[PDB]
Amino acid sequence: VSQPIKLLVGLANPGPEYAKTRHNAGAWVVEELARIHNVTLKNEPKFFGLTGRLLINSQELRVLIPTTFMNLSGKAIAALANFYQIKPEEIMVAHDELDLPPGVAKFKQGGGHGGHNGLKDTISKLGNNKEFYRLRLGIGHPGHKDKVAGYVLGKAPAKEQECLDAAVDESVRCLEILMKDGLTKAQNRLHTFKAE
């Protein structure tokens, strides 16, 4: 039974050249979960995004990858959330997280956007409501304010990308545990993980 998530959003910038930039880490999670569960994501221009529905341990989970600019991610999330009557507190938003290193991922309930343009827009489009969950996929931090945007929009080197892909995999396993055992159990597992 209880688990509050009805919608998982993986934040992204659109189109083939952005697919493997760090800023798309949330989208990697959603695509992998969707793949393992045999769901083909469908483009729905009415929701400014790619959508699907998975059944996991008899719970319906909607997924969404916006095709907006990252800074307009709330256009998508509010459109789909309004259509399905999903409250902010039932949404989990996967995203790249500067404040964790490659290879680590954490769940979080509420909090600020941290300068993340996607999170920022999401909050505003959901009525200045921060109380959605997050899946924070660590990307490291370049430790110079002026280098942040280029770092986030860049492509990790191969070795670092393996650490990233490992955290994606484990985040997917823990979303599955989320749906079966609940959040405390999912979180207890995810928060001890670090990739090699």
From Swiss-Prot:
One Pfam family named in its UniProt record: Pept_tRNA_hydro
Specify whether tRNA-binding is a keyword of the entry.
yes
Q: Which UniProt keywords apply?
A: Cytoplasm, Hydrolase, RNA-binding, tRNA-binding
PROSITE patterns registered for this protein in UniProt: PEPT_TRNA_HYDROL_1, PEPT_TRNA_HYDROL_2
Gene Ontology CC: one annotated term: cytoplasm
Summarize where tRNA binds, as residue positions.
Y18, F69, N71, N117
Q: Where is the site labelled Stabilizes the basic form of H active site to accept a proton?
A: D96
**Reactions performed catalytically:** an N-acyl-L-alpha-aminoacyl-tRNA + H2O = an N-acyl-L-amino acid + a tRNA + H(+)
Q: What class of enzyme is it?
A: hydrolase
Q: Where is the active site?
A: H23 (proton acceptor)
Looking up InterPro entries in the UniProt record yields: Pept_tRNA_hydro (IPR001328), Pept_tRNA_hydro_CS (IPR018171), Pept_tRNA_hydro_sf (IPR036416)
Give the EC number(s) under which this enzyme is classified.
Answer: 3.1.1.29
- Membrane-spanning segments: none
Does the keyword field hold Membrane? no
Site Discriminates between blocked and unblocked aminoacyl-tRNA: which residues?
A: N13
Which CDD domains would you find in this protein's record?
A: PTH
Subcellular location per UniProt equals: Cytoplasm
Q: According to the lineage, what is the superkingdom?
A: Bacteria
Quaternary state and interactors: Monomer.
Family named by the database record: Belongs to the PTH family.
Q: Which PANTHER family match?
A: PEPTIDYL-TRNA HYDROLASE
**What does the record give as the function of this protein?**
Hydrolyzes ribosome-free peptidyl-tRNAs (with 1 or more amino acids incorporated), which drop off the ribosome during protein synthesis, or as a result of ribosome stalling.
Can you name this protein?
Peptidyl-tRNA hydrolase
